[PDB]
Amino acid sequence: RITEMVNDRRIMIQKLTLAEKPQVMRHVTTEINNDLFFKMSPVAQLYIYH
């Protein structure tokens, strides 16, 4: 997922060893994407200015 989101080839993400692939982590309930930022448009001007 991190490779898919970062489409730039300049940034290289650390390769996982064989023992680090089945390791289990905890992710967020819902992902933050452009849809969340779109809904902030009415007050976005103040954020941009500051």
Binding site: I2, I13, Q14, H27, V28, T29, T30, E31
Partner: protein, 51 residues
């Protein structure tokens, strides 16, 4: 053009032969390798999740 014109090439060949036949008589012994270690990690910034 006489036998004197072959002096530098003669020295080249002589040096090559001296090196070659000094390699033959040199005694060779195995050495213990004492440097094995897993100390070649990579750093960077963690891609922390936001939510």
């Amino acid at each position: 053009m006489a036998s004197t014109t072959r002096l530098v090439n003669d020295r080249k060949q002589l040096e090559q032969q001296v090196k070659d036949d000094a390699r033959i008589l040199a005694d060779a012994r195995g050495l213990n390798i004492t440097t094995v270690a897993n100390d070649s990690a990579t750093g960077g910034q963690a891609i922390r999740n936001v939510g």
